[PDB]
Amino acid sequence: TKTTVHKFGLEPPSELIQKQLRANLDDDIWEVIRSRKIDGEHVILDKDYFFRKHVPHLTKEICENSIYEYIEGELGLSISYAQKEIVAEPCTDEDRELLDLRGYDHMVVVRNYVFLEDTSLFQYTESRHRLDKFRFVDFARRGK
Amino acid sequence: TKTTVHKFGLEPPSELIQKQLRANLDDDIWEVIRSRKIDGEHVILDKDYFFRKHVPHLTKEICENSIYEYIEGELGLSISYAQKEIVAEPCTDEDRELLDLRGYDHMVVVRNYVFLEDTSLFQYTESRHRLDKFRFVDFARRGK
Amino acid sequence: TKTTVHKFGLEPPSELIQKQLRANLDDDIWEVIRSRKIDGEHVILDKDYFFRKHVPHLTKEICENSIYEYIEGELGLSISYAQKEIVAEPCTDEDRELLDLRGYDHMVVVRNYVFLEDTSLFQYTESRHRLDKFRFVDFARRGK
Amino acid sequence: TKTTVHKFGLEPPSELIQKQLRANLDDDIWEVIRSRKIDGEHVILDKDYFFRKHVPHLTKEICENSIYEYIEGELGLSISYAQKEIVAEPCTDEDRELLDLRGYDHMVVVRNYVFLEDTSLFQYTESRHRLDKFRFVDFARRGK
Ligand code: NA
Ligand code: NA
């Protein structure tokens, strides 16, 4: 199941990432945009954004592997909680260029905001799935 | 936001509920099928199934209110964990009769299996949303 | 495993419960103090405190049974998240009057703050265990 | 807050670790035993045990830093869930040699079992705290 890095770069945030990542003008933000090919189709589009101030070093090779493992490796003990929001959205132009969308009109979009022990929003992920390629499992634990 | 009870009954399980609820032939299962009207449209279809042996008493009035609150009220201390599985599915005939599906072809389907302290699968819920009417939030808590 | 209700009453909050429950002077708060006898010893002291404004009706019989089930029954759908803090504390005078503390000097104290969908702190529980009678299990779920 | 590595080694499992880690005779297990000095006292004793087959490489320097971050870095995407069990135990001889236990007789013991996506128990941690130095926070998330 191959992973392709489409965009990857370190720049100031766009206005959307200023809102999503609570970042300023003068914050250096890593942007990584990838697609996943679950043979033989490109079906998920993964967009990560996180502050360089906390993760100063990154490479194209780390993105073709796991950004999660890399990030946990560098500062997993400072990461406190994440908040997930899963909705469905119309496909966008970016979605149709990069994924094999067949006769699909919508996506399942998982958004995830990762915060540090000190309370700051440090990372933002937007994971866009074709409908047939989305499955989310969890608990859930009940009682007192 | 009105709630309408379409089916409601106490019978032995169909073959699908035998699989979903790990129930036998000679188990009495409550089935409740409801739709939610988030004005002014019917947009969610909620199917609950649970054993009468654990919840012997039920009414149409409890279903028009909250089955969750009722169930927690009777045996919330025995409920241990739930497991959730969220996928997307094509709409079915039952979906089109009961919900206002406009020009919609798919649904977000949340399935939830609730287990007791003694380890048994006791309840099964299948909650079917029109795509624009689905939003799921959670944590997620990270670190050691 | 018998449950004994020692105090139970509806009054304005003490200064400690003002802090613990974020309640004012003119808020009516239910206080329930119970001990659990895990035969044949009294070993846990359970203190619950919650606003009457949200749970207007209560009885001694509900406390000898389950306050959790009762509360979930009345407003479980409005309850959003709880936050738990588990520490160890020296035993207090109240602990020695009401529990069989043998040659025990400390307690395991579980504190739990329950919040509503609207964001307000609605309930506070303080559960004090003798050391040998404390066991807490959980997950914990890992990965992306 | 300094970290001291007392034992560290790669051997077959003792009979206790065979039970705790579900390991055989012919499984190579890393054992790391550390104490934490929260100035100016040694107050926590951390025992980690995990299979070399999954983490082939390790050093004394990684243990003086974070084993969690290291492990997440190597295989965080394969880690599925953990299960935690927190109880209180009498102090042992190992506890009194390595920690400053003053006039303390008991410990808060946090045990944690980490499993992989494939279902196998892969790691076991036993974290022993002096009573005054234990605080555990969590959620807890409620409702349907
Ligand atoms: Na569609
Ligand atoms: Na003691």
Curated annotation (Swiss-Prot), chains A, B, C, D:
Induction comment from the UniProt entry of this chain: Probably induced by trehalose-6-phosphate.
Keywords annotated in UniProt: DNA-binding, Repressor, Transcription, Transcription regulation
Domain of life: Bacteria
Gene Ontology biological-process annotations: negative regulation of DNA-templated transcription
MF GO annotations: DNA binding; DNA-binding transcription factor activity
Keyword Lyase attached: no
Effect of disrupting the coding gene: Cells lacking this gene are constitutive in the expression of the trePA operon.
Function: Repressor for the trePA operon. It is able to bind trehalose-6-phosphate.
Subunit structure: Dimer of dimers.
UniProt protein name: HTH-type transcriptional regulator TreR
Biological source species: Bacillus subtilis (strain 168)
Taxon lineage: Bacteria, Bacillati, Bacillota, Bacilli, Bacillales
Residues of the full protein shown: 95 to 238 of 238
